[PDB]
Amino acid sequence: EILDITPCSFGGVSVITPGTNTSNQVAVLYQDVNCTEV
Amino acid sequence: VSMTKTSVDCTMYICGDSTECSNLLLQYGSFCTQLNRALTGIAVEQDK
Numbered sequence: 001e002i003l004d005i006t007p008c009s010f011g012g013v014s015v016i017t018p019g020t021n022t023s024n025q026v027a028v029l030y031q032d033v034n035c036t037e038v
Numbered sequence: 039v040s041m042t043k044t045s046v047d048c049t050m051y052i053c054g055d056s057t058e059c060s061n062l063l064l065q066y067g068s069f070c071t072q073l074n075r076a077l078t079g080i081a082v083e084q085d086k
């Protein structure tokens with residue numbers, strides 16, 4: 001049978017956060033991928 | 039005005055899906071880290 005092979009490890013991870021003196025809360029930017037890990 | 043923004047991951051591109059290969063890559067220092075920041079600065083300048 002014929003099986004297509006798509007490599008793993010979709011996209012990169014980018015951290016979006018304000019300054020240290022502002023707040024410690026962060027917002028993670030997943031690039032070119034659907035919500036998965038969360 | 040703007041050039042196509044391309045962020046190349048040197049961890050995946052150089053060593054595909056391999057930790058042992060990446061272990062040898064860490065012996066090269068910042069070659070991965072520095073080049074990834076060089077292309078990062080390009081994508082930032084294209085936005086500027």
Ligand SMILES: *[C@@H]1O[C@H](CO)[C@@H](O)[C@H](O)[C@H]1NC(C)=O
Pocket residue numbers: 021
């Ligand atoms: C944060 O900013 C405030 C107001 O400018 C300043 O008074 C304070 O020293 C800063 N704290 C830190 C940790 O940088």
Ligand SMILES: *[C@@H]1O[C@H](CO)[C@@H](O)[C@H](O)[C@H]1NC(C)=O
Pocket residue numbers: 032033034
């Ligand atoms: C992520 O979800 C959107 C929903 O429209 C979809 O179009 C997109 O293809 C998904 N991610 C990828 C890279 O396929």
